[PDB]
Amino acid sequence: MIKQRTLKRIVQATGVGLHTGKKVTLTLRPAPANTGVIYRRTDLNPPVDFPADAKSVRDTMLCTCLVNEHDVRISTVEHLNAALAGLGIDNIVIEVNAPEIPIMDGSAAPFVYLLLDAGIDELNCAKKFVRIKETVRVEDGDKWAEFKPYNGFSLDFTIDFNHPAIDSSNQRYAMNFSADAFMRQISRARTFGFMRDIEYLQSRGLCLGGSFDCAIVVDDYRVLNEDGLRFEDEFVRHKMLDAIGDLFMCGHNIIGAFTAYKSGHALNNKLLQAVLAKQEAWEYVTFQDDAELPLAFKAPSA
Numbered sequence: 001m002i003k004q005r006t007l008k009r010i011v012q013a014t015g016v017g018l019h020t021g022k023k024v025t026l027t028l029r030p031a032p033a034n035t036g037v038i039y040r041r042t043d044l045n046p047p048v049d050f051p052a053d054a055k056s057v058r059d060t061m062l063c064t065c066l067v068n069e070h071d072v073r074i075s076t077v078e079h080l081n082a083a084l085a086g087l088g089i090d091n092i093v094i095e096v097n098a099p100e101i102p103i104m105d106g107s108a109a110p111f112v113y114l115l116l117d118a119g120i121d122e123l124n125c126a127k128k129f130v131r132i133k134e135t136v137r138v139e140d141g142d143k144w145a146e147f148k149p150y151n152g153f154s155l156d157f158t159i160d161f162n163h164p165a166i167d168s169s170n171q172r173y174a175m176n177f178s179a180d181a182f183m184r185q186i187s188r189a190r191t192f193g194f195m196r197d198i199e200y201l202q203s204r205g206l207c208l209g210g211s212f213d214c215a216i217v218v219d220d221y222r223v224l225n226e227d228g229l230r231f232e233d234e235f236v237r238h239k240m241l242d243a244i245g246d247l248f249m250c251g252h253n254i255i256g257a258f259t260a261y262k263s264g265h266a267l268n269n270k271l272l273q274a275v276l277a278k279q280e281a282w283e284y285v286t287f288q289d290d291a292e293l294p295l296a297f298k299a300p301s302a
């Protein structure tokens with residue numbers, strides 16, 4: 001059978017919150033079958049749990065947040081969420097003693113190492129996949145996102161950037177998903193922002209953890225980070241990272257073809273909810289014999 005996975009052991013890391021600028025301790029814990037991904041704030045007393053759910057998502061000015069029934073929040077979950085998808089973790093408890101997940105270097109890579117430290121435990125319960133059956137499309141003016149039937153998981157992302165530091169040949173990225181491909185091509189791609197906007201946010205006591213160490217920062221003309229970019233098309237690779245984290249909010253790997261033009265957190269989530277709400281458009285599937293498992297969702301080599 002192709003089994004659900006959780007962590008072998010509890011692991012922990014610290015880092016700075018993007019918003020508060022304060023030290024945040026992150027703890028990742030194993031969890032039983034079918035419980036899914038649960039974000040938990042332990043700064044509040046009692047602790048507050050936020051099950052990863054497409055309906056709970058809110059796209060804030062910076063990054064994304066989950067909310068509960070009373071509009072308490074936990075922010076900056078999507079990069080870590082992308083690593084969960086990348087490594088094929090299905091059940092996990094993620095705790096922070098703060099209102100946000102630490103920003104780290106702005107990519108998913110530090111979470112990759114952290115998850116590898118924790119190990120993998122297979123649970124005796126079938127892993128459920130969401131298989132696309134109808135074509136579903138959502139749009140926001142010029143922008144659109146869609147899913148299409150496909151015996152795999154592919155992503156085709158076009159960003160439209162008329163910034164001098166983003167050349168024409170670097171506005172589109174396409175990949176067939178796999179754990180290895182995510183770790184190698186995507187996980188290290190950093191978030192990015194505009195210096196004047198960051199400056200402004202900080203003059204109002206926001207984005208206090210922002211630094212060159214946690215983001216690519218550009219002014220009107222160029223990248224300001226002294227080491228420059230990790231990839232020539234780092235910007236769009238990061239948007240792909242963000243899309244993987246957005247889609248994994250439903251807690252399941254999706255078998256289908258993802259395509260988006262100028263999409264982002266709001267639209268990708270809008271697609272995720274549109275797909276799920278349209279009952280005929282999708283179905284759960286499991287794999288009794290491993291050999292049925294499409295290559296995209298094979299266990300990571302590492």
Ligand SMILES: C[C@@H](O)[C@](C)(NC(=O)c1ccc(C#CC#Cc2ccc(N)cc2)cc1)C(=O)N=O
Nearest residue numbers: 062063078191192193198210211212215217242
């Ligand atoms: C890319 C987007 O989709 C989005 C939301 N961008 C961000 O979340 C984001 C995160 C952080 C920053 C920043 C910063 C900074 C700084 C700074 C640098 C030097 C000094 N001296 C002071 C401050 C910007 C954006 C994103 O990553 N979404 O997943």
Ligand SMILES: [Zn+2]
Nearest residue numbers: 079191238242
């Ligand atoms: Zn991001």
